[PDB]
Amino acid sequence: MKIQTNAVNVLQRTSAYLKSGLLKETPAWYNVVASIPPSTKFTREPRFKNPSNGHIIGKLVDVTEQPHANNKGLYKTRPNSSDKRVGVKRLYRPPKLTYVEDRLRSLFYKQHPWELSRPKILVENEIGDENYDWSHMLQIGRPLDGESVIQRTMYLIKTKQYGDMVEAYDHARYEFYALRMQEETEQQVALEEAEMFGSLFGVSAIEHGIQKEQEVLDVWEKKVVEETELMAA
Amino acid sequence: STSLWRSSTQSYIYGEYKGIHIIDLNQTLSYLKRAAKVVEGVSESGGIILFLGTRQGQKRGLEEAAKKTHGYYVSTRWIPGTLTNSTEISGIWEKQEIDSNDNPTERALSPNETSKQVKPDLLVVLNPTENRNALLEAIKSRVPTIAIIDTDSEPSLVTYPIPGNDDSLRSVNFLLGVLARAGQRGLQNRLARNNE
Amino acid sequence: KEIPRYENRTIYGDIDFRYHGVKLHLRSAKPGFGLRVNHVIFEICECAGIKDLSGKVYKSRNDMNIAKGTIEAFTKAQKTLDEVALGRGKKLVDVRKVYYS
Amino acid sequence: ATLNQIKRGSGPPRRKKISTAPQLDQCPQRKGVVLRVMVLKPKKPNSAQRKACRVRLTNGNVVSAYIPGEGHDAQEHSIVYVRGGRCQDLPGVKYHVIRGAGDLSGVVNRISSRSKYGAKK
Amino acid sequence: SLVKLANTCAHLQNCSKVRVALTSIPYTKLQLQFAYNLYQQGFLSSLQKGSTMGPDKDFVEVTPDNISTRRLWVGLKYRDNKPVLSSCKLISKPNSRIHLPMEDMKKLCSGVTIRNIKPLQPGELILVRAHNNIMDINEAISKKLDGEVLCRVK
Amino acid sequence: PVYRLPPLPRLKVKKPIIRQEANKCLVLMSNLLQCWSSYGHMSPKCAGLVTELKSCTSESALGKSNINYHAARLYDRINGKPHD
RNA sequence: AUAUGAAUUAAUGCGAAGUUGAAAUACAGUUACCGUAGGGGAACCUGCGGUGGGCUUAUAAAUAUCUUAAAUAUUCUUACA
RNA sequence: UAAUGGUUUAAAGGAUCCGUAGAAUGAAUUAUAUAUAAUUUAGAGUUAAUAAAAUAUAAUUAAAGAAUUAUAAUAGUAAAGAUGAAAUAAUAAUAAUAAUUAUAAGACUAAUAUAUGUGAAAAUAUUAAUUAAAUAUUAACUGACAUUGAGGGAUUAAAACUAGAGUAGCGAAACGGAUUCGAUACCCGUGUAGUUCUAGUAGUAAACUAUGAAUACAAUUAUUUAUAAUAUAUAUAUAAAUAAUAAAUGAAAAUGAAAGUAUUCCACCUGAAGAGUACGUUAGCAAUAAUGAAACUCAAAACAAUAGACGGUUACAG
RNA sequence: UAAGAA
Ligand SMILES: [Mg+2]
Ligand SMILES: [Mg+2]
Ligand SMILES: [Mg+2]
Ligand SMILES: [Mg+2]
Ligand SMILES: [Mg+2]
Ligand SMILES: [Mg+2]
Ligand SMILES: [Mg+2]
Ligand SMILES: [Mg+2]
Ligand SMILES: [Mg+2]
Ligand SMILES: [Mg+2]
Ligand SMILES: [Mg+2]
Ligand SMILES: [Mg+2]
Ligand SMILES: [Mg+2]
Ligand SMILES: [Mg+2]
Ligand SMILES: [Mg+2]
Ligand SMILES: [Mg+2]
Ligand SMILES: [Mg+2]
Ligand SMILES: [Mg+2]
Ligand SMILES: [Mg+2]
Numbered sequence A: 001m002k003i004q005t006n007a008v009n010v011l012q013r014t015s016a017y018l019k020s021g022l023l024k025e026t027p028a029w030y031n032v033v034a035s036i037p038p039s040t041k042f043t044r045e046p047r048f049k050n051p052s053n054g055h056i057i058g059k060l061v062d063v064t065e066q067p068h069a070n071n072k073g074l075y076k077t078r079p080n081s082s083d084k085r086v087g088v089k090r091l092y093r094p095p096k097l098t099y100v101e102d103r104l105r106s107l108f109y110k111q112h113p114w115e116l117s118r119p120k121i122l123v124e125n126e127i128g129d130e131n132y133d134w135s136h137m138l139q140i141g142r143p144l145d146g147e148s149v150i151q152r153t154m155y156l157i158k159t160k161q162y163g164d165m166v167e168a169y170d171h172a173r174y175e176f177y178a179l180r181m182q183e184e185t186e187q188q189v190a191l192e193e194a195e196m197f198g199s200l201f202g203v204s205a206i207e208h209g210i211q212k213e214q215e216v217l218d219v220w221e222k223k224v225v226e227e228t229e230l231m232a233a
Numbered sequence B: 001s002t003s004l005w006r007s008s009t010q011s012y013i014y015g016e017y018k019g020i021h022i023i024d025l026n027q028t029l030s031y032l033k034r035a036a037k038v039v040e041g042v043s044e045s046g047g048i049i050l051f052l053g054t055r056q057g058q059k060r061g062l063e064e065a066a067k068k069t070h071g072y073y074v075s076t077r078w079i080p081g082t083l084t085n086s087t088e089i090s091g092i093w094e095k096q097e098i099d100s101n102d103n104p105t106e107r108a109l110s111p112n113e114t115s116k117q118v119k120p121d122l123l124v125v126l127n128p129t130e131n132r133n134a135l136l137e138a139i140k141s142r143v144p145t146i147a148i149i150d151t152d153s154e155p156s157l158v159t160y161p162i163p164g165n166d167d168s169l170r171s172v173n174f175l176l177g178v179l180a181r182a183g184q185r186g187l188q189n190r191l192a193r194n195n196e
Numbered sequence C: 001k002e003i004p005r006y007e008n009r010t011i012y013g014d015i016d017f018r019y020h021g022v023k024l025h026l027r028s029a030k031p032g033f034g035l036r037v038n039h040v041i042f043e044i045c046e047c048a049g050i051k052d053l054s055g056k057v058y059k060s061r062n063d064m065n066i067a068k069g070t071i072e073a074f075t076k077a078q079k080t081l082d083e084v085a086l087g088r089g090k091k092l093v094d095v096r097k098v099y100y101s
Numbered sequence D: 001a002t003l004n005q006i007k008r009g010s011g012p013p014r015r016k017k018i019s020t021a022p023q024l025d026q027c028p029q030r031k032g033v034v035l036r037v038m039v040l041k042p043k044k045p046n047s048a049q050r051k052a053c054r055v056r057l058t059n060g061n062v063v064s065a066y067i068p069g070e071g072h073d074a075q076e077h078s079i080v081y082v083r084g085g086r087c088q089d090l091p092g093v094k095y096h097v098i099r100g101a102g103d104l105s106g107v108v109n110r111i112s113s114r115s116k117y118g119a120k121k
Numbered sequence E: 001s002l003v004k005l006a007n008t009c010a011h012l013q014n015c016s017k018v019r020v021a022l023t024s025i026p027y028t029k030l031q032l033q034f035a036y037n038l039y040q041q042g043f044l045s046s047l048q049k050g051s052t053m054g055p056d057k058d059f060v061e062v063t064p065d066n067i068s069t070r071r072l073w074v075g076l077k078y079r080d081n082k083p084v085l086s087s088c089k090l091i092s093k094p095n096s097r098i099h100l101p102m103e104d105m106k107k108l109c110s111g112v113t114i115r116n117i118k119p120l121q122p123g124e125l126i127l128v129r130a131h132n133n134i135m136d137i138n139e140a141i142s143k144k145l146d147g148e149v150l151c152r153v154k
Numbered sequence F: 001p002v003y004r005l006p007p008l009p010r011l012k013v014k015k016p017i018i019r020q021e022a023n024k025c026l027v028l029m030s031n032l033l034q035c036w037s038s039y040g041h042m043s044p045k046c047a048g049l050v051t052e053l054k055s056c057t058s059e060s061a062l063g064k065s066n067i068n069y070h071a072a073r074l075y076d077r078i079n080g081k082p083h084d
Numbered sequence G: 001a002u003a004u005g006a007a008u009u010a011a012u013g014c015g016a017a018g019u020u021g022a023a024a025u026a027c028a029g030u031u032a033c034c035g036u037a038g039g040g041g042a043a044c045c046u047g048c049g050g051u052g053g054g055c056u057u058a059u060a061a062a063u064a065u066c067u068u069a070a071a072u073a074u075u076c077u078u079a080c081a
Numbered sequence H: 001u002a003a004u005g006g007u008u009u010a011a012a013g014g015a016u017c018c019g020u021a022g023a024a025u026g027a028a029u030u031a032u033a034u035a036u037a038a039u040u041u042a043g044a045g046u047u048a049a050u051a052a053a054a055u056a057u058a059a060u061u062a063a064a065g066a067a068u069u070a071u072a073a074u075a076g077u078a079a080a081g082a083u084g085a086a087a088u089a090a091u092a093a094u095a096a097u098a099a100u101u102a103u104a105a106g107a108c109u110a111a112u113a114u115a116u117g118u119g120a121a122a123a124u125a126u127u128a129a130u131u132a133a134a135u136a137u138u139a140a141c142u143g144a145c146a147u148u149g150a151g152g153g154a155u156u157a158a159a160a161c162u163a164g165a166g167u168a169g170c171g172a173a174a175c176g177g178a179u180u181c182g183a184u185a186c187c188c189g190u191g192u193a194g195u196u197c198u199a200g201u202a203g204u205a206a207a208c209u210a211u212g213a214a215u216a217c218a219a220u221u222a223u224u225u226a227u228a229a230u231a232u233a234u235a236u237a238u239a240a241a242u243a244a245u246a247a248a249u250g251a252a253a254a255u256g257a258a259a260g261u262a263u264u265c266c267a268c269c270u271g272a273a274g275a276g277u278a279c280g281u282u283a284g285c286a287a288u289a290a291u292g293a294a295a296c297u298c299a300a301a302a303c304a305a306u307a308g309a310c311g312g313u314u315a316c317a318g
Numbered sequence I: 001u002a003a004g005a006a
């Protein structure tokens, strides 16, 4: 769509109306818009750095800055055909944001597919209210999930307590297991202790599933019988 | 989604992540403060403010913004021609004289006064992509407008864009509540000086 | 609309504007120079307050299209001296305005 | 269209005004002898009995000339003077005879436009 | 090279139509002089040396090793929803080079059509080449210097 | 492979096919006639069918798709047309 | 070489009122047209290839899911925190 | 008194490419008066290496396959074939048609398949081989050697012609049967030329993308397509093509990386009709091809779109 | 110092 002119210049056209006398009374917005001008450039703006990983956008390494033989043993003595092509488009293409955590988020849930069955709430409470010390995994205001493992891993890396991401990730994994075993034992023992004092529950999870299966299976029986009778004819 | 990008919104974008474009929230904050100040200034001047949003669950926020700014809202449907054909559409509905304190005077209006166009001083649209008619009418009727500009929306169609997500009711209600509070503060200042 | 005018009598520079099939060539003129243009353009200039103007119409000479396209020529294909000066950050001086003080 | 093509002879066609009376040889008029007087039918939608005559000019060309005016006295072997100007509804007749010149008398009892019909005051 | 200057003029028009803030042009003495004249005349916001990938942050010295990958990066100006550099055209074309003396240059600056060249406009810049120096037409008139009338920019 | 279409004047199925549920009466009648063909006429081996037939045909002897609406409603949203 | 007459002779234009075919324009009732060949007084007919300036005019073989449903969400008017 | 033009559709892109002249145009830095000189590698090239089916294209040579027609048999019997329905001087009792075998000959190339692709265009898709060409990226090298291209050259569908072979199917012409008021047509039957091959001539097509070539540039999306990675996943980057578009252009239809922004070179156009005609010339065995007028007549003539009317126009309902 | 019309 053509860059529109008549939405951002309402003040100028209104002032022409007022000066000519076509409009008698000044509108209520007139002085407000006069004191707060709209942005009227509507330009494409280049970018020179990827915000996420800090990679510089728009630098060409020269042959002088590659004085050493490449992996195939050949020196670089002249520019290649990629260096000679103007790369202005990269300056305007919105950069792809990248985080190592995402590679480490994919791994965790490949190693623990049943951690995907733990429901997650994506509704944020307030990102500014978070004050976490990742020296430990449990945090007040957070659940225990894969992100706890990964944030602890990143903490361990940035403090150089481990040099390799693999070892930090494994350490975080074992702390996560330590906490999960405690939680599951807490749940089981809480239920056991509740039953030992006369807690009378109604439908459990197993009975819930049984009743839903029954609801589905009744309709399935009816359809099967109807289809068999129809097929016979 | 990056597949639905309107490239004229390039300068508002921070990057792409998970197959969608991320809006640069520093720019969103700057534009939002500018638009909020425009709303506050218009409410402080006693002008008419209209809140337009025609998506499903936006009625509550629009009504509350209107009621705390002493403004007006539409959420059902924007009748095309509501501004450029105001006589044929809005001419029949009733009008009212009010004092500096927004107190009904209960004066009897002439039929000629009742028949006049009463044009908004400010239009804020929460879903400008589905409200092109309103934007074009505001341009023709020369009404400054504010809108939430998503990655697929044309920025130049509004006077005061706010880059942001127009698809989430939480984001829309956050921005709308900010503008409504700015209008409320302008109204409170107007009443304060009119009580002094 | 509002039409930019140099000295409230002519157009700022020259205009070579195409509106559909109509090629307009307008040229600003000196004081006392008349409206030496197509008759449609003459009527528009009479209404707009343009007093001095030269010009020629090529290709289509449809009256409606001439009329409509001359107004886009006046509004879109003109830049005032102030706009140019502020855009370039330079001072544009009118030599005749300064010769007579 | 290119500069070298314009140099080689490309350009706007000349607005060359062709002669509509080639048989006069760029003369205001020529003397002639009427070979016959004809009565022709105009093209449609016009309907009339148009008075014309074939005339051989002094330069040898034989042309068809319309005889204007209400009544004429042209007859075979009459000396006439022929100027340009076609009769629009008679195809092939591209010349007019001059009333009041030669053996063709001016229109009888003409009041208006007498000079166009060879009539005295 | 007038062909490359024409390419640059057309490229500047193209970049102004889409409103890109920064673009690149070929790295040559004529291109650099032209860009500098535009920059000093207020048509460009910035002029930098750089590579095919972007403007140089720090000085990078140009040698035959990197000459083929050098570019000149120019920042375009926009104001009040209008480009500052709208039109940019050659006067002296590659197939018809127009060299004028100082008197005809004064006539052109005074409103006279010389050799079918439309005269200078109120907010227009006509550049002239003299002794392999690009310069403003009025400056050439002041220095009493005949030259090749090169391009208009408005 | 994905075959995207050009901008269409419409998105409509010419003759949408619907769920024609078979009449129970006709199925019962077919089963009863098969029974009489195999086990003889007025056989006692499927009197139940006869009873059921009598019970189902007693009062009455015989006992639309919305795809176009939703296609028209959603075509502009899903067609992936580039922005104006 | 060039002009001027020429018996005879080829083509073509126009006009008045008509006259005859049904070739084209719709699937124009045998798709039209380009090239080429034969036939025919001619309009046209037929053969061979090409083009769309005709078929993009394109539009389903159909079935869908489980957590605290409310003393709890739905209320909320710068409040609390 | 309009070229401050045009050429997809209104008049107008050359069939295509190669390339000579160009008094056409054309890179970079420095020095000295647009040139000279020395330097440079961004255009344009050369040679290798690596990857890929460079499979497709051209010529040549050698093969395969389904079917058709005719001939001979075998058994079997009265109709067969064609059409809207029929009828045909040459279907069948001289045993036909149909079936099953066996021989012979030509021409063609089912599926894959999209002409995707390859080729300058024309063309080109059953198989194999020989020869020739065509891809990308790296390495090294030359140092503007380039672009375009009047004239010229080469190739160039189908038809046509000259010789010599071949001729199963199809089939101009011709002869018959129908249909019809009439049939000179559509339909049916025999069927010559041609369609096939070899050596030529000829150089035209709606030879079309109705769109000349090259260069620089301009906002997106989606698909493939081909490489290069990185560990099926990066909804992976870099190219080309295709599809839908922004902007721009445009009489609009629409084009869309060109019908945009620019530059260079060439071809062509200047109302309709007369007319791609006449005359002349050149070439050709001819048919013809190329070049290509004027008089006469008129105020027309055309393109896109709009709304109807109409259609031996579609679909849906009632 | 460049005007169009039927
Ligand atoms: Mg949105
Ligand atoms: Mg008179
Ligand atoms: Mg017919
Ligand atoms: Mg027909
Ligand atoms: Mg015949
Ligand atoms: Mg072809
Ligand atoms: Mg048709
Ligand atoms: Mg069509
Ligand atoms: Mg002129
Ligand atoms: Mg035509
Ligand atoms: Mg044409
Ligand atoms: Mg071509
Ligand atoms: Mg042609
Ligand atoms: Mg095949
Ligand atoms: Mg060439
Ligand atoms: Mg063929
Ligand atoms: Mg042949
Ligand atoms: Mg032969
Ligand atoms: Mg044969």
Ligand SMILES: [Mg+2]
Pocket: none
């Ligand atoms: Mg046959």
Ligand SMILES: [Mg+2]
Pocket: H185
């Ligand atoms: Mg017929």
Ligand SMILES: [Mg+2]
Pocket: none
């Ligand atoms: Mg026949």
Ligand SMILES: [Mg+2]
Pocket: none
């Ligand atoms: Mg040949």
Ligand SMILES: [Mg+2]
Pocket: H204
């Ligand atoms: Mg021919």
Ligand SMILES: [Mg+2]
Pocket: none
């Ligand atoms: Mg031809």
Ligand SMILES: [Mg+2]
Pocket: none
């Ligand atoms: Mg055009």
Ligand SMILES: [Mg+2]
Pocket: none
């Ligand atoms: Mg000929």
